[PDB]
Input
Amino acid sequence: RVTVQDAVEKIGNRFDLVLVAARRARQMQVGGKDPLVPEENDKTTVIALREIEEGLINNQILDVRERQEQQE
Amino acid sequence: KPLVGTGMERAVAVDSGVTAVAKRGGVVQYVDASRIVIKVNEDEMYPGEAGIDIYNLTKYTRSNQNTCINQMPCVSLGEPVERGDVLADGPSTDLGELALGQNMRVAFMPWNGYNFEDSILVSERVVQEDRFTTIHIQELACVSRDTKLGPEEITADIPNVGEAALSKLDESGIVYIGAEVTGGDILVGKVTPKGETQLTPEEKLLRAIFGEKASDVKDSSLRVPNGVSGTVIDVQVFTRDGVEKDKR
Amino acid sequence: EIKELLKLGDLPTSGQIRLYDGRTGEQFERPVTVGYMYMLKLNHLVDDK
Amino acid sequence: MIKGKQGRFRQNLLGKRVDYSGRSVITVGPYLRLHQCGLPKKMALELFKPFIYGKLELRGLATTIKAAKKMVEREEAVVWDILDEVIREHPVLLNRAPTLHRLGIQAFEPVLIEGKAIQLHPLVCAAYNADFDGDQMAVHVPLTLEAQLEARALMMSTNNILSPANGEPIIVPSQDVVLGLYYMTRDCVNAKGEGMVLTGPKEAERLYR
Amino acid sequence: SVTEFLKPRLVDIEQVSSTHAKVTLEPLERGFGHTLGNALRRILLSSMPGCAVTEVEIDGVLHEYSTKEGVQEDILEILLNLKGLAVRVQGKDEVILTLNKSGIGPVTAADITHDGDVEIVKPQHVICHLTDENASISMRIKVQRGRGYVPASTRRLLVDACYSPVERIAYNVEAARVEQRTDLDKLVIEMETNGTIDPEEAIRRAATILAEQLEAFV
Amino acid sequence: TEFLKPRLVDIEQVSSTHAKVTLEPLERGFGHTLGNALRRILLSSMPGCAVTEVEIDGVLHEYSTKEGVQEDILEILLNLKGLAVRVQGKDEVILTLNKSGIGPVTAADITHDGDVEIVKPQHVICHLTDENASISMRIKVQRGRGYVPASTRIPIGRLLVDACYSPVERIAYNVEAARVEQRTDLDKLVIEMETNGTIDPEEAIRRAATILAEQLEAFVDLA
Ligand SMILES: [Mg+2]
Output
């Protein structure tokens, strides 16, 4: 990835984008839980941004999954 | 020699001081890389015992900003010399004329970017034939004080150091002249007597009995600063009066 | 005087010569200057920076 | 204790010698993209050192940490590969000396060159205001993953085409690029290839070459 | 030892669509990227055997700057369109075809007569366009075999001959890596052809031509 | 449609160092292509025999100075780096020089060896001024390409001297019209090389041709 304009409108704020992407990247770095999109030698953080742009990752989704496993 | 001067380079170089200007005319009896002897012309000879100048040129020595002050002889053997001429070129001098930089065949043209704001290409030739290359001469000074708990020792014996470091040192603890040191090598083997009074009054008891450590010395050797190569030229030793001079 | 001095050598009076581009081997249009500018090397050395 | 320069109120304001820092003289960097900063080898093996340790011991090339240290200090060929991997995407922050603007702490991706000079894309020499006549820029790095994402999202050199004060771009072709463009498009009344109809642009480039 | 030089390992053959290819080679020694790139560029653009339309004539016109009734386009427009035609021909050096037709609608390359050996690679390529049924297009087109670009001035209307099938060739050199030495030049040639032959075989032909040229030395 | 292959029609030795070769026949466009390719390849990828290490007897380290010789040690190494030698067969080889007495120390008095041959004996190495002063030295020589300084390739009397492995120093190619030959447009390509004498024109041009042919044959087959 080079620019992050596509991710701005997906999470409108450009800072909540940063923290949400950091949440997903931390999940994908040591919290296992491989990315849902293929990687191209990309770091975990860029994969998080990529999936955010793909729309399949958002703060709501992360919270839903965290709550679901916290019920376990 | 600058290819476009102003006629002031000659006087600046002559009168600056570092050009080893002659004193009496005559003939150059014996040139050398470190000395020029000038047979005086008969007329200028003193009433007695002339025929001697012995211009001691200055072989390599450090300047005040790490630039070698090297004087080379610019007279062929037997060539006559007149009073007040230039026997030996100084640093950045060429037959007397001041020569600060060097020529370089330039072509004002914007090449593919690499001279964008003010940058300057340079063909490998300028570095290949090695016409820009200085002789910076550093001066690392290592000292041996006498703090509390005994003096500092400059012995080659150092704990927690491999045989590689001690390979090039001398027995005293000082590197040999002409040792192609590199980053991290010990120039001087220096050590300190393991801190100070620590632990508990049992430690004072130990001091009364004296410790039981063969090493009993911390490593404080002065190494090459990280990131600089170099070939040691000279290693001077200075002694406080009342200290017997060691092997080095 | 510079024009005459150059003319003493065979070099062109303009002070400019055509330069070929080494990488491709074509000609630079717009002929270019070439001379001997006595350049220094100030002691702001990168490996001290 | 609550007064003077050593007063612990005005203490984090005076200035902190931050770690993972750097410096160098600057050099033009054509062939770089607009989000790449040519970083030296000899300085990129002393900035991402702990990252190299991590990716090295993890890969098992030298499990024990002291072995990893002695490997990197040994310049073994594998450490170059590992360093390339870690700096694959790990934005660095290039900061000029007087940081008046808020662009003066822009952040780039690294690409490794040889020698020792922090290359720098030409177009982004305006916001910095550097002039490549001895100007020196410092390289910081973001450690924590949040800081990495910030350096890639909020500060990356490709997300600051418009400067804060004036809306219009501050990535504006400056000195030689405009002379090249100017030369590349000028009406000459009569020259070679005058009076003809070639094709779309492709045959035009073919004609010129 | 001195004879040794890092040979490339052909890696990238990315063939975007059917004619635009982006080949890359690496790692080459310092500067070989530029010399190979320029040699290939010059040989490809300047000297490449091929066949292209050279001369065209209209039955009812003898002047270049005129027009035919019922034609939405103009004579020079048809000249440009024909210049863009991609055609490969059998070993016959040159041959003349005709575009006799009449009707309403676009007139493409497919409307051209097959004439045995000659085969147009892009029949769907557009040439002209008629609007009136009474309007009849008739014209002769001669195609020769050549090894370069022939402007009209360098020479019964004349069409600049683009014999070389390669249409564009741009080479860059970008620094690759091999262990420590990091000034090795990865070459990157993107070339696009008219369609009479894929870029791969074009590069093969250019390389073979250069190699045969150098053969006499060794 | 045919492509006239070139041939090395002549190799005239205008001077000892620099010389000119002529290539013929060549067709339009091929002239400048081959000329530039050959200039570029020749100016870099060639084998040489430049000195690499020097070991003077009474010299401890480079920045010192001996006696009886006006030249400082650094000037001696500079001149040796400028020395040109023609070495065949053996990869690397050691030479000796123990000239004694006043006068020049030109390369001629270097100790004789086998296939090693000093191309330019006149090239001064150093000078002697004191009668009972002798300069005894061992000079190593290997063969390589391009440029390899001391540091990259890195006792105490082992003075390392930067390599300068290259036989050529100025390559210029011109393209001109040839005889009628019943066919115009045939280009004569005259390539002049200014070499230090270690390498003859024919050998250099053929090696350049070979290296380029190999590099391009790496292009003949593609995936
Ligand atoms: Mg400035």
In short: Residues 65 and 149 of chain E are 24 Å apart (CA to CA). The first strand of chain E starts at residue 12 and ends at 16.
